Design a protein around this ligand. Sequence first.
Ligand SMILES: NC(=O)C1=CN([C@@H]2O[C@H](COP(=O)(O)OP(=O)(O)OC[C@H]3O[C@@H](n4cnc5c(N)ncnc54)[C@H](OP(=O)(O)O)[C@@H]3O)[C@@H](O)[C@H]2O)C=CC1
Ligand SMILES: NC(=O)C1=CN([C@@H]2O[C@H](COP(=O)(O)OP(=O)(O)OC[C@H]3O[C@@H](n4cnc5c(N)ncnc54)[C@H](OP(=O)(O)O)[C@@H]3O)[C@@H](O)[C@H]2O)C=CC1
Lengths: 317, 317
Amino acid sequence: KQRVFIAGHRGMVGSAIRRQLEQRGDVELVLRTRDELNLLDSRAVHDFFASERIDQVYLAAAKVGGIVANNTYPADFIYQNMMIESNIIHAAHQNDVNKLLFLGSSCIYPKLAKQPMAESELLQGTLEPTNEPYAIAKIAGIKLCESYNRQYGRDYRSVMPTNLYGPHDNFHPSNSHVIPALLRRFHEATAQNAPDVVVWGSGTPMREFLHVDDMAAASIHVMELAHEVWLENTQPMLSHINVGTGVDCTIRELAQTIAKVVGYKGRVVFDASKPDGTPRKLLDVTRLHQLGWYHEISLEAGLASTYQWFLENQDRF
Amino acid sequence: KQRVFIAGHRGMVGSAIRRQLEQRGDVELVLRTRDELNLLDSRAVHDFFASERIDQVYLAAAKVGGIVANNTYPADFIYQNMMIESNIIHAAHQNDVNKLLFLGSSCIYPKLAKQPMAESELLQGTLEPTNEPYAIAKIAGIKLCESYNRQYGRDYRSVMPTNLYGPHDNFHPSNSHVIPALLRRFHEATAQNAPDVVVWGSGTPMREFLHVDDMAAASIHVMELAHEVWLENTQPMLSHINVGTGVDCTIRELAQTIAKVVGYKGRVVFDASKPDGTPRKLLDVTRLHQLGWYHEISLEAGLASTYQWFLENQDRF
Ligand SMILES: NC(=O)C1=CN([C@@H]2O[C@H](COP(=O)(O)OP(=O)(O)OC[C@H]3O[C@@H](n4cnc5c(N)ncnc54)[C@H](OP(=O)(O)O)[C@@H]3O)[C@@H](O)[C@H]2O)C=CC1
Ligand SMILES: NC(=O)C1=CN([C@@H]2O[C@H](COP(=O)(O)OP(=O)(O)OC[C@H]3O[C@@H](n4cnc5c(N)ncnc54)[C@H](OP(=O)(O)O)[C@@H]3O)[C@@H](O)[C@H]2O)C=CC1
C-alpha cells in the first residue's frame, strides 16, 4: 500500500487529487495542514519526510492569485513558491522518495508563443509581465525536477495545466480568473434581475479551460504511468507534459454559456472600446493524448456542476 | 561608516571586491567563512542578519564550476544557488538591509542571442544545455531582486559579468575555463620544453574577457551610484547591468598572447578537425558606459599579472 503525500491538499488542485485518491484503498494518504506543517520551513519539511515513510509526492502547494495579487505582491509570489518547491523536492530526495509530481501552470509560456503551445515553447521568449515572478519560480520548479532526475536518477515528473476551474476555486469578487468571476457576476445579475451585464472587450479572443477533476485525473495518470513509457515520451531536459483539452472557445461563447447555465435572462454585452488580451491561447496536448489520456468533462457540463457547488457553498464568499 | 557584508569573500569575485573595499576606511567589513555561516541554512542566515547591523550586501557566494561539473552535478547547482540567493535576499529585506548587489553571469543569455548581447536579450530564447540549471537559478536571483524592489521599495541591484579571469581563479587541471586552462598548459609545455601545444578547434571564434579586479571596480561603482541615476538607466523588470569590455578577440589571438606571456617558444597548433562553439559571444556594455564606468586592465596586462600570481601560488594546484 502506497503512502502518498499531497502537499496543499486543501487547495483547488490539491483537494481534487485528494478526492480521487481517497476513492481507493491501494493508497494511504499522509496530509498536513499549513498549521501542522509550514512548507517554507526547511527543517520542518526535512523532519516530516524523515519521520514519515512517503512513497509518492504530489506537489500541489503554491502561492497562487489573480492579476492584482501577482502585480501587488511579486516578491511573495517568487520567494514563497521557490522555497516551497526547493524544500519539498530536496527533502524528498534526501529521504529517498523517488516519485514526485510537480504541478506547474500555463502562465509559464512566452507571451507571444506559437499556438497551440507545444512543450518546446518553454523559455522561447519573454514572459507576460503580470506573471513574470510566479512564472520564473514555476520554471525553476520544473528544472529542479529535471536536475534531480539527471543527477540522482529520480523520477520527478511535471504537468503543465491550462486554465482550471471547478469547486474550491476562488469565487471571491477579488478573483480575476474569468470563469469564477463570470459565474459570480451572472449569478448576482440574475438575482437582482439586471437588464444587462457588460463585459470588457470584443469577446472574440479564444481561451482553453479544463475542469479541475479532469486535471486531477490526468495528474494521477501521468504520475502512475510506467517509467519507461514516460521516458519514451519525454526528454530529460524537456520533461513537462501539457494538460488540457486542446479545444478553444471565444470569451463570447463562454459568457453566453455561463448565462444559460445560471438561468440569466438579461443581455450579455461586450464593450469593444476596451482592449482584448492575446487573440488565442491554448496548449498542444499531443504528448498527453499519446500517453493515452483524454478529458471527460465538457464545458457546459463542468460549468453546470461547478455552479451547483457554488450554490451549496456561497456562504464562504 | 558603512557596514558591508560580502557573501563568499573567499571566492574569486568575492575576494576581489574585498581587496578593493579593504583599501578604504569609510567602510567596515563583516565577513563569515562557510564554516562560520552556512548560507544554505535559512535560520542561520536570518540569525546573522538579525545580530549584525548590515548596511550593504555584495552577494558573491555561489556554487560555480566548469563544463564537467555543470553536467555532472546539475541538481547541486540549481538547488544550492537558489537557496543561497533566496536566504540572503529575503533575510536582508527582513532585517532592513536596503542595498544589495547580486552577481550574475553571462551564461544566463540565450544560446543563439544577437551579438553583442544587450540586457534585453535575457529570456529571449533557449539556454545552453550545459549551463541550464545554473542559468535558471541566476535568472531567478535577478527576478527576486526586481520583485523586492517593486513590492517593498528595496534597492537590490544586479550586474552580469562576461568571462572573468585573474587571481584566485580555478587553476586546477579540472577547470574548463579557457584562460586558466591555457595558462596552466602553456606553463607546463614551456617547462617540459614540448615542441607544440595542440588546441581543439579552428581558433576563429571570438570571446570577451574581463579581469576580475576590473569586475570588482565596476561592481562597487554600480553599487554606489545614486539611486535616481540607476533608476534612470534601468527598468524595474529589466534592471541588470552587463559588465565587460565590449571588445572581443579570437581564441587564436588569446592562445598566442598567453604563449608570449608565459615565454613559450614552441608552436601553437589548432586542430580544426574538432568543432568550435558559437562564432561570437560578447556583451553590449552601452548601459554600463553611460553610467560612466570603463575598464582599465587590458588583456596582455591582465594575463601577465595573473600569470605572476599563478607563479607565486602554484603549490595550491
Ligand atoms: N488556480 C488556478 O487557476 C490553476 C492552478 N494551476 C496550478 O495548480 C497549482 C495549485 O493551484 P490552486 O490549487 O488553484 O491553489 P490554492 O491556493 O487553492 O492551493 C494552494 C494550497 O497550498 C497551501 N499552501 C501554500 N503555502 C503553504 C505553506 N507555506 N505551508 C503549507 N501549505 C501551504 C495553501 O494552503 P492555505 O490556503 O491554507 O494557505 C493551499 O491549500 C498552482 O500553483 C498552479 O501551478 C494551473 C492553472 C490554474
Ligand atoms: N568564476 C567565473 O568564471 C566568473 C563568475 N561570474 C559570477 O561570479 C560569481 C562568483 O564566482 P567565483 O568568485 O568565480 O566563484 P568561487 O567558487 O571562487 O566563489 C564562491 C564562494 O562562495 C562560497 N560559498 C558557496 N556556497 C557557500 C555556502 N553554502 N556557505 C558559505 N559560503 C559558500 C564559496 O566558499 P567555499 O569555496 O569555502 O565553499 C566561495 O568562496 C558567480 O556565481 C557568477 O555569477 C561570472 C563570470 C565568470
